[PDB]
Ligand binder design. Structure first.
Ligand SMILES: Cn1cc2cc(-n3cc4cnc(NCC(F)(F)F)nc4c(-c4ccc(Cl)cc4)c3=O)ccc2n1
Ligand SMILES: Cn1cc2cc(-n3cc4cnc(NCC(F)(F)F)nc4c(-c4ccc(Cl)cc4)c3=O)ccc2n1
Ligand SMILES: C[S@@+](CC[C@H](N)C(=O)[O-])C[C@H]1O[C@@H](n2cnc3c(N)ncnc32)[C@H](O)[C@@H]1O
Ligand SMILES: C[S@@+](CC[C@H](N)C(=O)[O-])C[C@H]1O[C@@H](n2cnc3c(N)ncnc32)[C@H](O)[C@@H]1O
Ligand SMILES: [Cl-]
Ligand SMILES: [Cl-]
Lengths: 384, 384
């Protein structure tokens, strides 16, 4: 039963060994390796994963000397794919590279002979930032719980207490919310899905019991779970084949997992493998920073920000703020506050958010937002 | 100046030769080729494009005998990449294939020994459908105009009137809207961006003049354009290198272009290269069908629908309808109407929307929604 004024919302997350997420992490390991040697590296590194194969494809212009074999294989090792029995092995997989320089036509139109603050956007596009006061970290509970379920699986795999676990996993959480003057209040968890790759020996009942008792109960507060919560645990019945062997991975195929779990809005751009001149990442990070600053500044409880760019043009084409009815300020007033406090040119975002720093591999699993006090998660004190 | 009660929104689109879109079209050409011979083919075909290369990667179990070289090259020919001078040539590129059977573990958990109507979802995930009465086709004007600008470029390339054009293009449209009791009314076009690949001989002024006079004016009604509309036409200054040579392409990297241009919501799943058992596509198509049926049925002016699944489970885990204040019915009443009129199991969607038919390549440019009276665009007459 859904009481009037309440509603359901669902988000998902995936683990570090999910094949798409493998690709995001490798793309960002490559980015970080370049940035460690050349803070101004121009990087657009896609990764593709299938059985036995990591392929890097894209465009990099950089003064760095990067050992792609080592970078790729160390990222896969970190994830946990270290033996043919698990379906993938960093020691013995194929690493292919189809990397060229950045197009000179892009370079000339974006950054050649431009003052850093006045570099053009590296592409056109639209980006959104979102924040919600329903959790301290200003993220939707649906996505936070989904991420934490995957993190718990990785924790119990790595600590050896559930040694039948393997790195590829997916989770999904449906929460019922109460409307509260434009904001939302979580009531209960309606449905949880967990699927995780596993060894050939463990049986379904052992896995389902462990997923409930050692994963869900260790993550989701009991106050949100009741006798009617629906659990779909290993619903396919068998998930021995996994990782890239089970399903091809590509960079930028988990963009909703990377952001807000379907809340807010999304402009379509992927984050991983891209340096700060690619506004798909830098402007989305800055828009998150704006949104979170508006909420933590007490101006909104819930807020969406849209920005957009034209390739070669530094300033956003427009900015808009939607507060869901949760501000006493008007949309015009909030925009004025944002314009007075933020400069969303990529060549200024880079300074404010320290986006030449090689921290990107850390962003590439468990969402880019709501964790670890990255610069875009530290609210700006607003003057108005 | 933005009057209170009005706001800006931006969407983008890309052309048929945009490298990500090339990949979507190839993935769906492969799907269609399989379905022409085996309506029950299980297809999960990713495409990757870089200079000189189309790679197919993924999982296909099918009784069809498909000539991947021919299918790929004919799709690239159709797009218009037919000479080294354009950066890519269907006759002479490399076509690599890394395709395996569908994982038997997925097959057993999804469809093996299951009645078709009771096939499980091919994955977990969340999907949204959206419709808006602001255009006859029930799509956001921002995205419709952006698509039409790309289509116009392709038209003028193919008819030889702008022979300097090449297949890779991007467009972006910002519209100012009036709020209208939860619905939206377009007022004016605020900013247009167009970038299109071009030959080495044509100059920037000739291109910018043509883009305004022969493309924008031929697409965007004059009533929406005024002396303050901002035009960013060839803003990078030079776009001779393009297609995969300029920028790697991957399937499923234009998911917001494929859907609502940022309006509504998105669950993250990509459409192209996937048969109907992959709910990322079938359930999103069905959710669009539901949303459009609610609007065309006079129950809403604007509506968002969320559904979600667990792998192996046929019925959606939940359904929710949000009408933005544009229905006299409650959310409970709309849900009741939807449940009485629709069955969102994938093995029923396939019948209602005829999803074994090989029409998918046609969906893979210019958006999956709002055009050509595909089955999900033909509203269902609702009984209640
Ligand atoms: C006074 N008040 C009214 C309110 C209405 C509020 N609300 C109620 C909703 C009810 N159902 C659904 N269903 C899910 C759907 F099917 F749409 F996808 N979504 C809602 C959303 C919502 C819409 C789009 C997105 Cl991306 C995220 C959430 C919402 O914001 C919340 C607080 C309120 N306070
Ligand atoms: C009485 N009434 C009130 C209304 C408010 C309405 N509205 C006003 C908006 C104002 N600004 C923005 N800015 C863009 C942003 F920055 F948020 F991304 N978005 C709005 C949206 C909107 C929110 C999320 C999404 Cl995906 C798409 C559109 C909206 O729905 C529309 C009709 C109304 N009628
Ligand atoms: C279900 S697969 C997508 C469909 C697949 N490409 C096919 O050929 O049917 C998407 C993700 O689900 C997970 N997955 C893979 N095998 C699975 C299985 N046997 N059971 C449950 N989930 C699985 C992995 O995380 C994988 O990346
Ligand atoms: C700008 S590229 C993304 C960045 C690129 N990977 C890099 O290395 O900087 C994204 C898309 O923009 C378009 N594009 C490519 N070259 C361009 C140019 N010189 N000017 C404008 N747009 C261009 C193509 O549609 C391409 O797929
Ligand atoms: Cl997936
Ligand atoms: Cl792009």
């Amino acid at each position: 039963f859904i009481e009037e004024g309440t509603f359901l919302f669902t988000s998902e997350s995936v683990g570090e060994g999910h094949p798409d997420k493998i690709c995001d992490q490798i793309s960002d390991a490559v980015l970080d390796a370049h940035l460690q040697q050349d803070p101004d590296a121009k990087v657009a590194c896609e990764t593709v994963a299938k059985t036995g194969m990591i392929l890097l494809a894209g465009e990099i212009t950089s003064r760095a000397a990067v050992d792609y074999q080592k970078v790729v294989r160390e990222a896969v090792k970190h994830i946990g794919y270290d033996d043919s029995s698990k379906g993938f092995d960093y020691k013995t997989c194929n690493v292919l590279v189809a990397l060229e320089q950045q197009s000179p036509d892009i370079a000339q139109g974006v950054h050649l002979d431009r003052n850093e603050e006045d570099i053009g956007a590296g592409d056109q596009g639209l980006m959104f930032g979102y924040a919600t006061d329903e959790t301290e970290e200003c993220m939707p509970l649906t996505i936070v719980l989904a991420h934490k379920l995957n993190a718990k699986l990785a924790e119990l795999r790595r600590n050896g207490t559930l040694p039948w676990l393997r790195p590829d996993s997916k989770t999904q959480v449906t929460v019922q919310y109460m409307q509260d003057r434009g904001a939302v209040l979580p009531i209960r968890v309606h449905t949880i899905v967990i699927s995780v790759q596993h060894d050939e020996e463990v049986c379904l009942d052992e896995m389902r019991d462990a997923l409930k008792e050692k994963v869900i109960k260790a993550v989701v507060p009991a106050k949100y779970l009741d006798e009617d919560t629906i659990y779909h645990l290993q619903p396919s019945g068998r998930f021995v084949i996994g990782g890239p062997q089970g399903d091809a991975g590509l960079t930028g195929r988990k963009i909703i997992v990377d952001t807000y779990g379907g809340w807010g809005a999304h402009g379509g751009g992927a984050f991983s493998g891209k340096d700060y001149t690619k506004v798909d990442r830098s402007a989305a990070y800055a828009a998150r920073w704006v949104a979170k600053s508006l909420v933590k500044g007490g101006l909104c409880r819930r807020v969406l920000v849209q920005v957009s760019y034209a390739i070669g043009v530094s300033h956003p084409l427009s900015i808009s703020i939607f507060h869901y009815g949760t501000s006493q300020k008007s949309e015009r007033e909030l925009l004025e506050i944002v314009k007075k406090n933020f400069d969303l040119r990529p060549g200024v975002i880079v300074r404010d958010l320290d986006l030449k720093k090689p921290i990107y591999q850390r962003t590439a699993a468990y969402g880019h937002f709501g964790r670890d006090s990255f610069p875009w998660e530290v609210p700006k004190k607003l003057k108005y």
